[PDB]
Amino acid sequence: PLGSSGFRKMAFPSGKVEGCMVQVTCGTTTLNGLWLDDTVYCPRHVICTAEDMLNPNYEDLLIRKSNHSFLVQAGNVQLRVIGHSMQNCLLRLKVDTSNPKTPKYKFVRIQPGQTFSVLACYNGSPSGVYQCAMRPNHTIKGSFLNGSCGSVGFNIDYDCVSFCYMHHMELPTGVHAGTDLEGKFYGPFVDRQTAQAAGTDTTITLNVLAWLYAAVINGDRWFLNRFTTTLNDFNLVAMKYNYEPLTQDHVDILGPLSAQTGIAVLDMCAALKELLQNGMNGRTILGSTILEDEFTPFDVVRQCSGVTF
């Protein structure tokens, strides 16, 4: 139906979020802010200077700031800050103007394995959009340059924009860490430039299974077989390839796709099982040579059914 091409890593239309991006400057430190109604949300380290990043005392640094300390700009117009407060690792700046482009929205905390669209921004101006998955080790493999902090991650659930991520930093392994819109970090990371490392990461088995279902839905079904497996037996095999242990909850999440295809989850696991033990023998799935793990069951239904927003 979609073509013989292969699954495209599609991001949600970003228009509604672009309408919320602004630039926030505190002294010489400039980054991005999220403007919703009369509040601008941004990383608290915006109040930090060059040497204030090793181990900043945010509480004491903020005390020395007044509403006039923050320069907020939407396009070429200044947005007057009339109040400020810190919430975990975010700053909440009250402005005298409610964003006319505020979309229906909500803040949600994403869970490991789930995906979202990232709108990379610089100087309050959206530069690009791509799909990311919250890795099992609580980091995301994004693409960010200096000045990108404040950029946000989101999903669109029907007619509502669900914000789930705000960018704060990069780890030595070249991966990224951030918080939800309540300023709470995903993972054990802290917003300071100290020695911090992401734990060992694993392949999101739930997503790989969802991707195989997408392949079947698209007509790529050569890898399917006549057998089934137990969760226990599948996990013994999968964990050799550093795959996340599959749980009964993951099985259930795959329910809609299992129904659409009539293929029981454990039956698909048996297929995945053989793929890991015998490889693809040169063949491809959805035009791919490897097993994609950044497409959730929801992303599959979204792309295969043509859901609009």
Name the residues annotated as catalytic: 45, 149
Q: Are 273 and 231 in contact (CB under 8 A)?
A: no
Q: Rule CB under 8 A: is residue 221 a binding residue for a second copy?
A: no
305 binds a second copy (CB under 8 A): yes
Nearer to ligand I12, 74 or 206 (CB): 74
CB of 247 to ligand I12, least distance (A): 31
Whether residue 62 contacts residue 83, with contact meaning beta carbons closer than 8 Å, is answered with: no
- Return d(Cα 77, Cα 93) in angstroms, integer: 16
Binds 191: which of a second copy, ligand I12, none (CB < 5-8 Å by kind):
ligand I12
Binding mask 53-82 for a second copy (x = CB under 8 A): ------------------------------
Q: How far is the CB of 230 from a second copy (least distance, A)?
A: 30
Minimum CB distance to ligand I12, residue 52 (Å): 8
Pick from a second copy, ligand I12, none: which does 169 bind, CB < 5 to 8 A by kind? ligand I12
- CA-CA distance, 103 to 19, in Å (whole number)? 8
First to last CA, the chain: 20
Which residues contribute to the site for ligand I12 (CB under 6 A)?
3, 29-31, 45, 48, 53, 144, 146-149, 168-172, 176, 191-196
Residue closest to 43 by CA, chosen among 26, 60, 27, 65: 26
- Minimal distance, residue 195 CB to a second copy, in Å: 14
Residues 106-165 binding a second copy (CB under 8 A) are 119-123, 125-130, 132, 141-148
* Secondary element (H or E) of residue 110: none
Which of residues 189 and 243 has its CB atom nearest to ligand I12 in the complex? 189
- DSSP H helical ranges for 239-296: 248-253, 255-261, 265-278
Q: Are 10 and 306 in contact (CB under 8 A)?
A: no
Which H or E run includes 304? helix 297-305
Kind of pairing, strands 160-170 and 105-107? parallel
- Which parts of 191-210 interact with a second copy (CB under 8 A)? none
Tokens 């669900």 belong to: 162
SS3 117: strand
307 binds, among a second copy, ligand I12, none (CB under 5 to 8 A by kind): a second copy
Q: Tell me the C-alpha distance between 9 and 236, whole Å.
A: 30
Query: Which does residue 309 touch among ligand I12, a second copy, none (CB within 5 to 8 A, set by kind)?
Result: a second copy
- Footprint of a second copy on this chain (CB under 8 A)? 1-16, 18-19, 119-123, 125-130, 132, 141-148, 170, 172-176, 218-219, 287, 289-290, 302-309
